[PDB]
Write a protein that binds this ligand. Structure first.
Ligand code: UQ3
Ligand code: UQ3
Ligand code: UQ3
Ligand code: 8FL
Ligand code: 8FL
Ligand code: 8FL
Ligand code: ADP
Ligand code: ADP
Ligand code: ADP
Ligand code: MG
Ligand code: MG
Ligand code: MG
Lengths: 557, 553, 554
């Protein structure tokens, strides 16, 4: 028909796709990243009918990574939408990554029709089984009338407690099945994650422990960024005058330019601290397990975590603070108003930290200042860091490209750096940047990737161009994974294409491409890329043997 | 000979495991020995751990979680490779559903033989993982202190659950240098957390506003060891309360504020419910019609934030430890005058429904005619229940009627089929209670079908001098009897002489068919210094009192 | 009243399930009823299926796979949701390891309550899947014929194994129109495959060239119903053979060509081994040193291609059905004159070691001391075992010594702990053998520990009038007795236990034996008693098996 409003239309019935779209919108899902196909086309269409922003990606890998980044950036679970069978299996990448990083996510996976189960149906798969080991919550929606219930429970399970991934299986007959409107049971709106507080004796014992320590170190993790505790943490550091270290994605909770940051003397600080205060940060590989040879064997630990089971992993916790980061630091701030202790302005600990920071700055100064071409990493970031706005979102991915950018690119706002994370994952790059451009379109999004990392997700540049996302992709091409290689005899397994013109990919989709080989070219290329009104790629050819500055300890062992 | 030089520099995995378990507070180990866990049980006893050898790993895995509940620390179930671990999956699943801690130590075939078809080779970690909070294989003996500490912590901290350690034969017998073994920290008490002060005040204001309030006291408060705080809270507020099946005893059952005798009316008519460590699962009928008002307001105290607002939204969420939060509530109550008034229409309706149900079952309690009904039988059982006894209840009618006729006056003093509705926990639970609290009498009241699942464990009780008192209510079938016959699927043996099983292992056996025999038989069984079975032949068609709603649907 | 108008156009899930099960040849259902499977058991009886109500789901699941092995068709285990299913995982795992078919039907909570914390809500398909060849939830009652057909076929065809059907409560009670239900085909006999002719001929070439050949008869041949072909093959080739524990009976244990009494020498010295439906797992010592020559040539017949060449490479592979391939071997041998010669140095060495092992246990067999040793006990047992009896053996010393002292003359007549070394199969296996073959005697010989795992199923045998004869060898411990305790030893049990009184609790006959003079009259009264019976024998605490060069495990 031409949908003449004069025709009688029954409004009693509603299908599972529409019920799913309404339940999602009610639960605060604003962004849905995916790829359509059988049987989830009606879901994405109904989502747009309710005002949800649908972002069609180029691979389910990037879609599942984008949804957890968007969840991290908004504070509520956002959705990944994938087709049955291989759609879900490609999306297991996001679930595993979200599980390891304690980020929420909602994977909506279509399934083949229930009535054809056992028959070898198109894309028939045991989807709940496969997803369950990676999920905090996984279930199949068996009938469309239960959809509000299942969406409510899946969002609550992903968001409350230690966050994780939720998976909802949607069979075809459920997506298309219809039920009476009045017969659909309502579901309550999931609110904010419940915050819990620590007992008072633990709050006072924490402050008691801090006073006794000669060389105390506060470690700020991305659990404080997730808890939205930046104000409380900045008040605590300002009030106590304690030295602090930020984790990779903990950067920005405290501003990177804060004078109390031991960032430039990280190895010395971990080695010589007699007491560590863990704020939303695990003693996993990223903090070298809290054990020798990176820490003192007798290091005392105050540990603030939402997960009671994490307390005392690897290295025992003297003072355990189990609860919400924002709430517990608020408790600490209120107890410090009854006390008057602060960490003194002049101690040997402060002197050793300042001297080591200056030594590390003096060690990288010649590399930052060296204008020879092909350029090293520190020289390239000199021009990048000079042009990064104070409110930018930075996505970093690679090995040397990522690790050197971690120290050369400051963050001043929390939740403004997205990188390989606790799983050390390549492939999150353009997925994370697309999520950052959809969640905060008023802020510049700059992705700085190595040449290898770009190849995992570089095709999502089309997605950015398709939705008018002015994402700035900067590629540091040394021609290999972690390091370049000469022309050979077969090629090295770590070898790629040092002469690749990755910037031409931008021209395929209507973006701007720039190619940098000499130091004099870098400045004008970056300025034009930031000023170009759309997505851009800047492909920088760096020295094949460029490396990070030498450290006493390898980052891994 | 002590004059012979003997190298003391090395220690094997079985000894490291026993030392690590003793350090983390494991005092009881239930299992069945065999390849390759024999040295583990031997090493455990040398460290002072009490080892109890059962007759089936099913009962062993149930005993381990029962003792964990009673002691407040994870206790051990030790089983052999292959079918040992698969037999023990029953207990892991039950522990997961009840949120009880548990440490299963499972032997495994030697790692050097993986893929060859070794004796009892199995993917044991993979099988157990979906039923556990924690599951891992110990790959090298030097890691044992680390893994024992992490498993005990994972099972005990937060929402408790099952932890599993896979112990290959080469790790059990593998030796390492004693000085090279890295020590682990001792897992302390479970961390407690509190609610925000705003939430404490919102909870108290909501209690003041309600016209028909009801406190529901769950076994989570028994696990939290929060009985003192709960009794102060109920005594301070004068609020009516309902105890869940194993929440019984947190408040004494004879307390004047209990709505136990008017449970259906209390849930149906309340306008506000205060859930204390209780879930809106099937046991509480999901907090939804037809058993509740569609507009019921909910204050929900739970340690798990993901459980908040399941099935029925919570108006006030109190996320944290039960004892700590009720402690906060008691403190905030010390600055208010409010208490629930002594005279309200809500109290009078509760009292009239209690008196109604009492008159309904009074003729069955007093009826001395034989074959007896359930209420007449429990009239003599209840009269001889010591107040410090640990009561194990198991069956359908036998358990459900025992739940109302057998009061508890202390917490953690009733063990029953639980949140999983499990038959087969009876003697395993009773064995665990007798090992943990040998100074307390242990009475298991089972139906005749329930006794069939684990009845062989009576030999375990006798072998260890555990004076467990097993009382069997024998109607001749599952849930109900049946006339003489193919036989009905639910039918069993109405004439079975189960008490003769006691006489097979030195216990005392008593057979009762008449009401005049019940009193003297219970007294002779209670007095006997050893285990005892009282087999009672009840009426085939005896049943529970009529109700408006079926317990399930 | 039949005069009342009754609508007969609808049928529910439990009835569809019963008709589907009976259509697919399910004759026996072992379970324990309760929510939500009560209608399924009642419906099964209406279609003539024999329902046996057990006392624990553990035994129920072991019973179902034993009946599948004896009947050649998957039989049912029926369990309630939640812990019923979790208790039955033991049988699935044991059926998987032994390659025996089995159909587990598990009730489930109603689908419409999923996620709510319903009574006995559980991820039952997820838990059972690693142990099953086939595991699915029946989502709608109209699908029941389809799923039953697919599950029985998946459990029975190819390498057999367990199948699991999850039956939610709203599917059990749900109704469908009679004429709307889609029919399902009847699963027939398992497909048999043959070997290429060049493999048949090369296998025969290998046999001729061997100086010390050995044929190993495994329970794969028993499951394939290949006893006729195997007997014709050993009789035609005159080859020495060794039967596995449950391969016993495929060839009569009294055949002159059995090397059973010289087992270690036959494996150690054979230059060529012909595996007939037997794996080189722990039971055959992996086919490797120190139990075999390092250069041992292997011919391997197995239905599973992936099994071929495990641990020890096979010189000739025969992938197919046991009955079918041995038929090819017998056919090809009719165009050959070769047979293994009547007199060989290999034959004399086998004879000598048998004679030496016979003389090694002969004094223990004849020793009339009380407390008795194991061999003395079995002298009276074996002298009273009917030739058509079904033997169930379970324990450590009790089972291993019963293996050599109780011959089997027919196949599929011995049921024991199997490839998984499982305790707890005893009375479930005996109940299944009594239900399936009620005209045949069923004798279960268990140790004291093993009887404690399933002893309560004696009430099941008494309730269904199954004349199972339970002989318990009580040494007062697990594998060995123990002196009185000071904490009791972990392996210790009750040497003075009167296990036979359990029989008197359920109407059976109980007998107690301590002296050797009492053993004879007690066994004769137990066999003559018209019903189940327990013979409790207090054996010596330190009695052990014949000394061997190698330990059974390592
Ligand atoms: C294939 O397979 S690959 C696997 C994929 N790969 C990844 O997933 C990489 C993930 N890895 C990480 O996440 C980090 O690697 C860790 C694990 C957290 C360790 O951290 P990190 O050891 O790398 O420390 P960070 O990067 O912060 O800094 C390095 C050195 O630069 C000094 N420094 C910092 N800032 C300044 C400054 N502004 N000026 C001068 N010096 C500075 C600082 O003091 C330190 O020097 P040090 O103190 O050790 O002498
Ligand atoms: C297969 O397949 S199957 C076997 C599986 N099965 C299980 O796993 C059992 C699990 N099931 C339960 O856990 C309970 O079933 C629930 C779910 C908690 C419901 O609870 P419940 O509805 O049964 O209530 P409760 O047991 O407390 O008492 C019953 C009636 O006795 C009244 N009453 C209480 N105390 C007294 C007293 N002292 N004197 C006189 N009357 C009393 C009370 O008031 C109520 O009567 P009402 O108020 O409804 O008229
Ligand atoms: C904890 O956890 S633990 C409990 C767990 N445990 C189980 O799950 C038991 C599983 N174990 C087995 O399945 C078997 O154990 C194997 C692995 C197949 C090895 O088998 P097997 O090495 O034990 O050999 P078999 O039992 O056949 O016979 C023994 C010796 O008796 C000789 N022999 C045979 N027949 C006669 C006769 N009629 N007269 C005189 N001697 C005879 C024969 O020749 C051999 O003597 P040998 O030749 O070695 O000197
Ligand atoms: C390839 C790879 C990297 C690229 C370094 O090369 P790239 O050009 O991106 O940066 P460079 O160091 O400046 O050369 S890192 C890394 O861990 N990894 C292994 C790796 C591969 N795949 C996935 C999913 N996660 C990974 N973690
Ligand atoms: C058999 C069985 C019961 C016995 C009632 O019969 P019993 O004689 O013990 O008590 P009665 O009511 O006085 O006659 S209850 C029940 O749920 N059930 C099913 C059931 C079976 N197996 C497992 C593991 N869990 C279960 N839950
Ligand atoms: C207890 C036990 C056995 C009894 C030997 O003692 P029993 O009195 O039955 O026989 P005895 O040797 O004549 O004294 S064997 C064994 O492997 N095992 C460990 C064992 C335990 N649990 C399971 C499920 N499977 C097992 N396999
Ligand atoms: N609201 C919250 N309050 C406190 N801690 C939290 C909260 N949410 C998550 N966490 C914890 O923060 C920790 C983050 O650790 P990790 O991912 O290792 O951070 P990083 O990698 O920055 O060190 C997790 O262990 C998680 O349990
Ligand atoms: N220390 C604690 N404080 C408060 N609640 C707890 C604690 N430990 C466990 N819980 C919670 O108590 C609840 C027990 O509820 P449930 O087992 O349903 O009780 P019942 O069976 O008596 O209704 C679980 O949801 C669990 O998360
Ligand atoms: N019809 C059949 N024909 C041939 N082999 C079969 C058949 N069915 C099963 N099998 C095989 O028989 C083998 C049984 O070996 P196993 O259980 O090790 O027996 P045993 O313990 O007697 O050695 C399995 O590998 C299985 O694949
Ligand atoms: Mg590179
Ligand atoms: Mg009964
Ligand atoms: Mg024994």
């Amino acid at each position: 028909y031409f949908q003449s409003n004069a025709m009688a239309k029954s409004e009693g019935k509603v299908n599972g796709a529409t019920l799913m779209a309404r339940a999602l919108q009610q639960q605060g899902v604003q962004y849905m990243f995916g790829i359509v196909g059988f049987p989830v086309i009606p879901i994405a269409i109904a989502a747009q009918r309710e005002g949800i922003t649908y972002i069609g990606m180029r691979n389910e890998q990037s879609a599942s990574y984008a949804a957890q980044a968007a969840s991290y950036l908004t504070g509520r679970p956002q959705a990944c939408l994938v087709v049955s069978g291989p759609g879900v299996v490609h999306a297991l990448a996001g679930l595993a990554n979200a599980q390891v990083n304690c980020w929420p996510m909602l994977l909506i996976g279509g399934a083949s029709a229930i009535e054809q189960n056992g028959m070898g149906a198109f894309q028939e798969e045991r989807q709940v089984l496969l997803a369950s080991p990676l999920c905090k919550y996984a279930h199949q929606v068996e009938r469309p009338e239960r959809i509000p219930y299942y969406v409510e429970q899946a969002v609550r399970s992903a968001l409350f407690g230690r966050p994780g991934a939720a998976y909802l299986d949607m069979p075809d007959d459920v997506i298309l099945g219809e039920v009476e409107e009045a017969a659909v049971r309502p579901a309550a709106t999931v609110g904010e994650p419940p915050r819990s507080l620590a007992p008072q004796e633990n709050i006072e014992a924490a402050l008691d422990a801090l006073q006794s320590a000669k060389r105390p170190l506060v470690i700020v993790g991305k659990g404080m960024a997730w808890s939205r505790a930046e104000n409380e943490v900045r008040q605590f550091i300002e009030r106590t005058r304690l030295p602090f270290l930020a984790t990779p994605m903990g950067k920005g909770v405290m501003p990177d330019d804060h004078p109390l940051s031991v960032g430039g003397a990280r190895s010395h600080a971990l080695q010589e601290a007699d007491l560590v205060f863990l704020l939303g940060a695990r003693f996993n590989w990223i903090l070298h397990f809290g054990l020798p040879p990176r820490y003192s064997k007798d290091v005392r630990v105050i540990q603030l975590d939402l997960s009671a089971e994490e307390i005392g992993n690897n290295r025992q916790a003297e003072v355990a603070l189990v609860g919400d980061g924002k709430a517990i630091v608020g408790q600490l701030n209120q107890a410090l108003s009854s006390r008057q202790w602060f960490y003194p302005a002049e101690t040997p600990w402060r002197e050793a930290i300042a001297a080591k920071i200056a030594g590390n700055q003096a060690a990288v100064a010649p590399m930052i200042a060296d204008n020879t071409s092909p350029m090293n990493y520190y020289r390239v970031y000199r021009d990048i860091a000079a042009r990064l706005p104070r409110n930018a979102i930075i996505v970093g991915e690679g090995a040397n490209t990522m690790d050197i950018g971690r120290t050369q690119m400051p963050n001043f706002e929390p939740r403004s750096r997205l990188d390989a994370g606790s799983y050390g994952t390549m492939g999150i790059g353009l997925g994370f940047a697309v999520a950052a451009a959809a969640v905060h379109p008023g802020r510049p999004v700059i992705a700085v990737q190595g040449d290898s990392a770009f190849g995992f997700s570089g095709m999502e540049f089309e997605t950015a161009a398709r939705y008018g996302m002015p994402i700035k992709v900067i590629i540091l091409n040394n021609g290999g994974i972690g390091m370049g290689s000469p022309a050979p005899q077969p090629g090295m397994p770590h070898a790629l294409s040092h002469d690749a013109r990755y910037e031409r990919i931008a021209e395929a989709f209507g973006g701007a491409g720039f190619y940098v080989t000499d130091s004099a070219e870098l400045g004008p290329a970056l300025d034009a890329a930031m000023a170009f009104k759309g997505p851009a790629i800047v492909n920088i050819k760096i020295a094949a043997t460029a490396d990070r500055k030498p450290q006493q300890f390898n980052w891994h062992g």
